[PDB]
């Protein structure tokens, strides 16, 4: 009986371990689908960047968002080389709106000396005058900051809501 | 996030290390690609060396998941070749036959936990006898050990280590008693 | 011998269940992907800059 | 949702022990999470331990080794610590801060919950009622746990309290006279014991139910502080939202209180009694009292804190306060352990103040309370007789006292003693209890009513 | 580039112009270049622990700024060395300065750069071959016992561009040279590792193999294991000396590392005197134990900072040989005197203390030290598995069991061989308190026992049961008297005395009991427990009957048997064979069976 | 050598107990020495406890009474405290700070040594194995001293630790089968104790070998910080350079520790147990650990501190840390003294960690270790039985317990009790130990091997 | 009027611009209006022992100064009521917020104004 119980115990361990690896495998497949979705999102953002007309408005948003988050008196906008005219326009429009909404005087320079890497999808990084404080409004950063918050809704939309979850508080 | 306690960077460098090491162990045990079943079992990791690559190329592929990159599976698969390599090397004057080598490999692969195995213990004892002799001086103790371990290597060549051959068991016991006995 | 044999059947069973679940997941994703992606990109593009709610003057 | 982009400061103005002081911070939040990059590329999380004006004191989870002014960057995540919760984490193993360590994926959140949670409204909490069976006869029969009770397993260093916890995790479940879940949370558990938990739950099929959090003895003590809160946040999600009865097994709350001490001393508060903070009562209460049944939701949260009592002193702040907040005590006992009895649960000082709700007809069985009382009485009288035996001698003993000695032997050998992998339903524990009570003729079972004696005693 | 001293208060030197200095970086204070370690930062001012006496440092003294944390040199040369707490070789300082004092700011290198080590490359390596952290790219014939397997440093990688041919090389010679992503790295035989950073491992494994000390009490009732964590009090006549030296002379450990965290000066001079005199049998040849041991001396008067770093240096050397693949064993002479350095430094830094004054992070520090133990699957390509057993002595004030270092230790160590002062005063050695000492490795080792010594586990359980029953019975015996005891109680007492005097008692200074192999230990315990079983069988079977047997009959009937059960301890493996001892113990069992059968 | 003129500052910025905080000091040097000219010409000395920028926190040895800002002139000597040393320091009496008070001239320096003392290499420190025949049997037979051991005499207020130390001084010599110089650092000893020690050293004609550093009770209370360092520096000069064997006595390490406490409180350092500075362990180690032999040199330093244990609490920080640092303590016991047993040495809580390797064949005798162990065991058991006798009365005791009680009585009467002028050779002490062991039958002497029982027991 | 939070260290909040605040007056810290008690004044600052968890309070958060010390609201509606020690009505919190938790910084009127 003890020997038979040895065989049964090994059977139990093997079934348990196999089922556990299967569980993790399905969960990792799900994570892989989500990663695929986010890579697709990054490529779509690159496609948007290709289109200047919307990209100019998007930069008008991002630059001013950086200015609002920093609220410094002297500031430096760092952008990709490809984008320089667009970021120039964005800063030129952003300065008056910054003045009006914050009442502060401000001096915004564009860092022609050192652009962002050409691989970056887009967006800007706004440093304060001494470059000790940085707000990273590049499109990859924004997409991450958005997707990580979106995951609950992404899980719900892609894989169907949880039917066990009766109450939401 | 850490995998196995190693930062993923170190983890993938280790994967590339195992790949290169399995390549080396194959190149050592079988330069003439005689061991075909083993070659096929290790084709997936060997391919990255049978086709030349940069270390950083293999590392990029691993970090992307294109390589075989489950470090535990790689460790198991490498240990099988490593123990087989020790078997063949520690009897180098008496190199054994190809079908026997493949049988050894197959039994080792089947073994549940090779490192903790009696198959590994016997190799360790054979190495204990052999390594002692690489610098031993002429004296009756060392002459008797040389003779007894040479016949032990012959017997290992004949019967592998999967077989608990009684001749080999006796040779181990007596050789180790002789080794443990004081030189005086 | 029964233990040696039946565990192959059990392995086939568990892998079959895993494959079914992965297929269901992939199907659901390939169906809802477009409407998730358009929303996600629209939300990325909608900037809405604001000063910190504690700002004074 | 937080749209605004994060501010990353290189303005580190000091590094004093586990704290990094940053200055010129814009509107710092207290308890804000920070991700700070060391000069050499490494990354470490931190929690804004304190705030003042434009300054922020960041308790870096890992040590401050290698941090410097002028090159360390420090991204402020703009929100308090939040745990992602789902059912998917039921059947996973995580480290102290929610990172998976089972080589699975990062959790795909069903929600983000603030790990401090909120106190359950006392006018919404309900009485626990039905039983949670642990399989361990010594507590199912004699100290049963009602759904929503918080009952700690006191134990000294060296006793098998970890093994008992693992057995409870592997065996527990509803009395089934399938919506049950377990949240194991090991604080300050040494590597070998953590590996024991992980591999045991993986091997014995229970992992489907068990979400296991591990804070190794050498993981950051701040991760130790936040592990019980992660455990209980997941438990609240699985109980009061997924409506499944959860059992939370917090392990080594002494190792948690040591981390609390470390964080207090880092804050530079003066010590309270026995070196522990003054507010340890409120804190341990915040952990424990995230339990119990709630009106209008068919789930619950049971807790089983596990305490390493220093010096075996039941007056020590940890066990004293834990007794104040919790509703019982289960003693793992050194004399039993040395005699090599397992589970060495000493049922004389053990108690379950809400056992009276977990038993009776429709919950365990008609005779549960009576058998528990009678077994306790006969065990205590047997211990008395065993103390007396060595003084008066065996042949000076009366036949009734010999019956009690035999009962003592067989209660310590057949009922208390279980072996790690033997799972006994409450019904089986009761039948073993009856097999022991039949050592006595009915007239000696004076605490059992006749209406029960006549029904159960024969056979 | 370099700052300036700005304040000095004992071993704490505040230094200005340290703008970018990194926490726990090493600095060279003073004109003598004392070694120092940054322990805090404020703006551009660092605060520097100094590992050497500061008396005579002055404000304005240059504080040079080495860009590396406290790091220990690991390479051929360790084995046999006597190291100062921070790796300075005391023997080389003596031989080099030709005088008995340690000059302040002495800067002799940790490993001799003059020795021509014999280096043999791993044969299968080649130009362009890929190697990764932990790979054994060569082996050095350090001495007849240890073959120093040279490993690529962890956090290193790439394709080999030059691997030196077999030969003789200095510790400085470029022995290998490899490239990664176009940057070249030149490697010599000595690497540098920050002592406070865990040396990485591929995978930690359960510690399921016994580490036999010499003591029957410890090997049987409280087993230690390969890679096990242990705590012991610093007793006298036992403890520090007996166990350490016995593990040294013979055990399952392939390398022994010692660290005298706060050792008394003359006791350290004892260890440094005995260890190079001890020898062991290996392959039928007596070989010194310093060919496989390393000592990290830190006497109590050496600076507090060094007293702290001693433990870390020792454990890092132990982890280095672990990575090579050995079953290393480390003995830390006083984690209590280490906690003193932590306390004093915290006070000097003005931090808030906790229980008894210790810094609140004592638990975390002790964890970071101990949890580097265990059996590990080493990094790197050639598969291997070493281990690092750790045995850290504790010394609470007056034997107090609430002392915070003892408590934090108990919370970490899987084995605790507590001390019984009553036995110590009786001069009963070992003085192990077999009632509150514990070992949590029994669950693991039961497998090894069921494979090698299948009968040992029930013997262990019954021995513990007997000891506990005797403990219970003595309380009555002293309160009332022995008259009321039954035959079973009498046999329990009179077998517990046998166990406590002739099994759990070991004269570590005699040739026969300097070390008790496990076959001898299990044979002894088997005979004693068999005697218990058969005596209880006789009295139980003849109880409630007229032909009553009693201990009073058994003792006189077979007084010889009891004498031989007592004398079992004297068998000497060094001259008596394993076969002889096993046969003798089996013959004693036979005599016991005959005597009992005749009494029946 | 130092050719540069010394800077003299009238810049005192504070006076605070024993401290004097300066300001505007040019490049202060920690541990520097300072000569304070007070307003009235009185010239005091002090040591720079800490420097910070332009500040120095002087610690004035002769106290601060009478010091004032704006007129006290501190001359900064430019170097750490280097004391003169010469062989003719033997046969002198110096005050606490090493100035002469025997009306002889100052010490014409044979060399200048830093009172801290340059640390010695553990690799070339020799192990002390030559046993000192102190003559006191309670030491030689059971806690023997070896030439090089740090072996403090713990004692309490009112016990005869002075008499014990004087007897050891006048009787100590190597075992027969090299005459000690004495260096005696009196700290906080009242005039009666100082004059007792001085008159005894003259009475035994030893003065040509004794170098007294007196810091009486009424002498300034910071000077006794450096008095033991002066004593050990002269001891090191005599031992490791002049080749003499030196026995260092330190009269009250508790007075030293209380001077340390005074300074620590004046500095407002974070204080350790019982208010003493946290670094007391290190600072006492730098005093004690200057004993022992060294290679090449033929001299040696034996060291016999004396501790007054407050409230007789051996767990008090001074005795506790001294027991960590020193190789075992002789222990003078009030319960024996009140019974009028001189020397009141209690052999149970006292040990000599270098005894074990300083006794045995060829060194003292073959039976020394065994007699020591057996007497210790019999004494311990006798004390336990004596505790029991009070509870159970002499009727309930077994005849073996009575044997033990008689052994305890005759052991205190014959072995410990000893004439103050009687030096029992180690051989006589061993014979007197056997005379007691032979109270017992051989069967009860379990700690003596059969060989050394048979050889010695029956004679 | 409003003060502003100037520091947060656990429950101890430190508020600026509180010139007129009365000692042991109650204040509502933060946007969630957590309750706190002024345990100290200094200059025109104030130290506020915040009763509820402070996690998430930030510098610059408005501090609404209640005009009265810890006080109970006495009037019709007490009878049959359940109150937390601070006079928070639990039988109305649960009913109005339809949740099993006491919302952090809840501000339910102790005695219902709605019921005639």
Swiss-Prot record, chain A:
Secreted recorded as keyword: no
Tissues expressed in: Expressed in brain (at protein level).
Entry keyword set: Acetylation, Cell membrane, Cytoplasmic vesicle, Hydrogen ion transport, Ion transport, Membrane, Phosphoprotein, Synapse, Transport
Keyword Phosphoprotein appears in the UniProt entry: yes
GO cellular component, one term: endosome
An individual GO BP term: synaptic vesicle lumen acidification
MF annotations from Gene Ontology: ATPase binding; proton-transporting ATPase activity, rotational mechanism
Membrane topology, from the record: Peripheral membrane protein
Subcellular location, record wording: Apical cell membrane; Cytoplasmic vesicle, Secretory vesicle, Synaptic vesicle membrane; Cytoplasmic vesicle, Clathrin-coated vesicle membrane
Residue spans crossing the bilayer: none
Domain of life (superkingdom): Eukaryota
The protein's assembly and partners: V-ATPase is a heteromultimeric enzyme made up of two complexes: the ATP-hydrolytic V1 complex and the proton translocation V0 complex. The V1 complex consists of three catalytic AB heterodimers that form a heterohexamer, three peripheral stalks each consisting of EG heterodimers, one central rotor including subunits D and F, and the regulatory subunits C and H. The proton translocation complex V0 consists of the proton transport subunit a, a ring of proteolipid subunits c9c'', rotary subunit d, subunits e and f, and the accessory subunits ATP6AP1/Ac45 and ATP6AP2/PRR.
Family indicated by similarity: Belongs to the V-ATPase E subunit family.
Function noted in UniProt: Subunit of the V1 complex of vacuolar(H+)-ATPase (V-ATPase), a multisubunit enzyme composed of a peripheral complex (V1) that hydrolyzes ATP and a membrane integral complex (V0) that translocates protons. V-ATPase is responsible for acidifying and maintaining the pH of intracellular compartments and in some cell types, is targeted to the plasma membrane, where it is responsible for acidifying the extracellular environment.
Official protein name in the record: V-type proton ATPase subunit E 1
Organism: Rattus norvegicus
UniProt lineage: Eukaryota, Metazoa, Chordata, Craniata, Vertebrata
Gene: Atp6v1e1
UniProtKB/Swiss-Prot annotation, chains D, F:
InterPro entries in alphabetical order: ATP-synt_VA_C, ATPase_a/bsu_AS, ATPase_F1/V1/A1_a/bsu_N, ATPase_F1/V1/A1_a/bsu_nucl-bd, ATPase_V1-cplx_bsu, P-loop_NTPase, V-ATPase_su_B/beta
GO cellular component: apical plasma membrane; clathrin-coated vesicle membrane; cytoplasm; cytosol; extrinsic component of synaptic vesicle membrane; melanosome; microvillus; plasma membrane
SUPFAM superfamilies assigned: P-loop containing nucleoside triphosphate hydrolases
Localization terms from the record: Apical cell membrane; Melanosome; Cytoplasm; Cytoplasmic vesicle, Secretory vesicle, Synaptic vesicle membrane
Residues annotated as binding ATP: 353
Membrane topology qualifier: Peripheral membrane protein
Subunit structure: V-ATPase is a heteromultimeric enzyme made up of two complexes: the ATP-hydrolytic V1 complex and the proton translocation V0 complex. The V1 complex consists of three catalytic AB heterodimers that form a heterohexamer, three peripheral stalks each consisting of EG heterodimers, one central rotor including subunits D and F, and the regulatory subunits C and H. The proton translocation complex V0 consists of the proton transport subunit a, a ring of proteolipid subunits c9c'', rotary subunit d, subunits e and f, and the accessory subunits ATP6AP1/Ac45 and ATP6AP2/PRR.
Family (UniProt): Belongs to the ATPase alpha/beta chains family.
Name the UniProt record assigns to this protein: V-type proton ATPase subunit B, brain isoform
Organism of provenance: Rattus norvegicus
Gene that this polypeptide is encoded by: Atp6v1b2
